[PDB]
Structure formats: C-alpha cells, structure tokens
Amino acid sequence: GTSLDLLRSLPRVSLANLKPSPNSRKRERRPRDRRRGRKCGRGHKGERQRGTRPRLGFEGGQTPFYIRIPKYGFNEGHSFRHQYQPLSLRRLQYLIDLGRVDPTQPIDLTQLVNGRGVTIQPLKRDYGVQLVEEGADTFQAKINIEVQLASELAIAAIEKNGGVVTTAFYDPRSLEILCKPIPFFLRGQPIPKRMLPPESLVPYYTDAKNRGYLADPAKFPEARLELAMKFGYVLPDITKDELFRMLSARKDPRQIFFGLAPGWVVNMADKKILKPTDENLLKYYSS
C-alpha cells in the first residue's frame, strides 16, 4: 500500500523513535502548583477535608434508605436455582451453515460447546441448554439434538424437518466432564456414572410430550402425531430415512459419552482405554 511506501523513505524505526497512539495516555496531576495545591481539591477544613467522612450509605443519622425498606425474598435461593443457557434455532442454523456444528452426527452439549456455539458455566449453576423457538420459521435443517430443556414450538421445528430431539438431564458433576472432556481424561480417573434427576425434575424427563430421555418410548408416536396436527405439518416417517440409525442413536441414561461406558480409563498418551475386570467394580458401574 501507499503507507508502506512512506516507510521506505522515512528513517529507521528504533527504540529512540517510539511514540504512543495520540491521546492514549492521560496526564496525572500532582498537588504541587497553585492551581492544584493549597487546599488540594478537598475544600475548607472539615470532616470531608481531613478524610474522615462517614461510610457509604450513611445519611447523617436518619435511618438510611437501604435499611428502611422491608426485607423481601427477591434473591432467596438464587445460588440454588437451576440455569439453562438458551439456544435459538437461528443460532443453531447459523452454526450448521458455516460448518461449526456438523449435522451428520448426533448433536450433544459437547459438540455445541466444542463449536463455540454456546458457553456453559457449571460454576455459575448452568445445568444445560434450553432450546428457544426463535428462528423456527426459517429453520430448514434435519438434525438429531439432545438438550436439557426444550419448548413445544422448538420441538415442532426440529421434528417437522424430520429430525429428532430428546431431553436429557446431566448432574452438576457430569456436566463439567461433558463440557470439557479432555481436561478430565488427563486427570487419570475412571469415567463416573451419570446420576438421575432430582425428585422435582423426574416428571419432566419421564414425560413423552417433553421428549424425556426416561420417558416411555411407546408413547412417543402419539405425542409426535399430536404436535404435527397442531402446527399443521405432516409427520415424516424417519424409519425410511437413510440415516435412521444416526437419528435414533441415544446414549444410556447412566452414560455421559456415546461410545464410552462408565468406569473406563482413557490413556490418551497410549491411545488406549483401560477397562476393569473386577465383579464388584463392574456391578457398581453397570448399576
């Protein structure tokens, strides 16, 4: 460019020629000159001038504002409430379009996080992803996806195209392994089991209408049909579809990863998977 041609003429760049970007630094003012010296910006003698004014929120001796308001449980149990990151079909379509979420294979929270499509924070009480209806009208992809929460309209968009959506619960410990699997294989521990939902969440994940992972499989076809009629689309028979096996693939309710059983150890250095043989240890994991 023309800028580089200017460098050719100009003298060498060196440590003696450096300069910061203009206005990059403000100048700090010492209390030395008459303008900023003398009383030094503090005012005439007094409590605020000696530096001993009362604490923040003190109002000179009347009951402060933040003390005379009734105490109310807006934030009770905030640290215990569950948080589900929202994923919109617009974001899902956009990720697929640019190749960042491969639709050929099943989509699980690992793949979504692995494609920088969602950011999961188990420390801040993230327990998964909830599918968001936004973008349903323009959603034209056939995919198999597992999400901890889903909405009635969000499910309809996935299924109408012939995809599969199932809702699966991951416990706080399992989610952290799911989100960052490799920073776990490096520890050297065996893969833990996946714990069942708490009593409060059991109804949601055992219900077909929500596509629960613990729900009765025989009851799905009725649920799929009713949703199709309500939203005015024809339910597509996915058994005929060539990639039916991939669409129907589902991990065991006590399994975190698709091809890895609980209890195995992943020797990444040697590209091996140590597996136990003991009976009590195999009964513990297979339970």
Partner 1 sequence: VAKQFGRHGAISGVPPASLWPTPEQLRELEAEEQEWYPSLATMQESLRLQQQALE
Partner 2 sequence: DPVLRKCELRIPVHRRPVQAWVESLRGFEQERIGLAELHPDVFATAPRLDIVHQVAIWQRNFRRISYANTKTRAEVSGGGRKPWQQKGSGRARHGSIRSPLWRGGGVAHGPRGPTSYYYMLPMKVRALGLKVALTVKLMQDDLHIVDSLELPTADPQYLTELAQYRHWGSSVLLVDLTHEEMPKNVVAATSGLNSFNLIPAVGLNVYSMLKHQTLVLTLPSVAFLEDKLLWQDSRYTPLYPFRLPYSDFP
Partner 3 sequence: NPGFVESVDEYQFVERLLPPTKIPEPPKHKHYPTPSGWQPPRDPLPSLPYFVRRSRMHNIPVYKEITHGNRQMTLIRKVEGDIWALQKDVEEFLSPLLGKTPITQVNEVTGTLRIKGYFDEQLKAWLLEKGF
Separation of alpha carbons 92 and 1, rounded Å = 40
Q: Nearest approach, Cβ of 199 to partner 1 (angstroms)?
A: 5
Separation of alpha carbons 245 and 263, rounded Å = 26
Q: Are 262 and 255 in contact (CB under 8 A)?
A: yes
- The pattern of x and - marking residues 109 through 138 that bind partner 3 according to CB under 8 A reads -x---x-----------------------x
Q: Are 99 and 82 in contact (CB under 8 A)?
A: no
Of 139, 169, 170, 205, the residue at the interface with partner 3 (CB under 8 A) is: 139
Which CB, 49 or 248, lies closer to partner 3? 248
Which CB, 11 or 60, lies closer to partner 2? 11
Residue written as token pair 């494609």: 115
Token pair of 257 as six digits: 């990863």
Main-chain dihedrals φ then ψ at residue 110, nearest 5 degrees: -60, -50
Of 13, 69, 123, 234, the residue at the interface with partner 2 (CB under 8 A) is: 13
Q: Residue 260: which of 187, 182, 146 has the closest Cα?
A: 182
- The pattern of x and - marking residues 181 through 210 that bind partner 3 according to CB under 8 A reads xx--x-------------------------
Residue 103 interaction partner, one of Mg ion, partner 3, partner 1, none, beta carbon < 5-8 Å per kind? none
228 binds partner 1 (CB under 8 A): no
279 binds partner 1 (CB under 8 A): no
Residue written as token pair 């040697």: 270
Separation of alpha carbons 204 and 127, rounded Å = 15
- The pattern of x and - marking residues 213 through 242 that bind partner 2 according to CB under 8 A reads ------------------------------
Which CB, 121 or 267, lies closer to Mg ion? 121
Of 31, 54, 203, 221, the residue at the interface with partner 1 (CB under 8 A) is: 203
121 binds Mg ion (CB under 5 A): yes
Residue written as token pair 């294979």: 105
Helix pair 152-160, 220-230: axis angle to 10 deg: 90
Of 161, 206, 248, 255, the residue at the interface with partner 1 (CB under 8 A) is: 206
Q: Which residues contact residue 153 at a Cβ distance below 8 angstroms, ignoring those fewer than 6 apart?
A: 133, 136, 231
Q: Are 107 and 127 in contact (CB under 8 A)?
A: no
Separation of alpha carbons 205 and 211, rounded Å = 7
Strand 144-146 to strand 164-166: parallel, antiparallel, or no bridges (unpaired)? parallel
Which CB, 119 or 140, lies closer to partner 3? 140
Q: How far is CA 18 from CA 12, 13, 152, 230, in A?
A: 11, 8, 61, 69
Q: Nearest approach, Cβ of 144 to partner 1 (angstroms)?
A: 25
* Contact positions vs partner 3 (CB under 8 A): 1, 21, 90, 93-94, 97-100, 105, 110, 114, 138-141, 181-182, 185, 257-260, 264-268, 271-278, 281
Catalog residues that contact partner 1 under the rule CB under 8 A: 185-190, 195-196, 199, 202-203, 206, 214, 263, 265-270, 272, 274, 276, 278, 280-281, 284
Binding site for partner 2 (CB under 8 A): 1, 3-4, 6-8, 10, 12-15, 18-21, 24, 113-114, 116, 180, 182-183, 186, 268
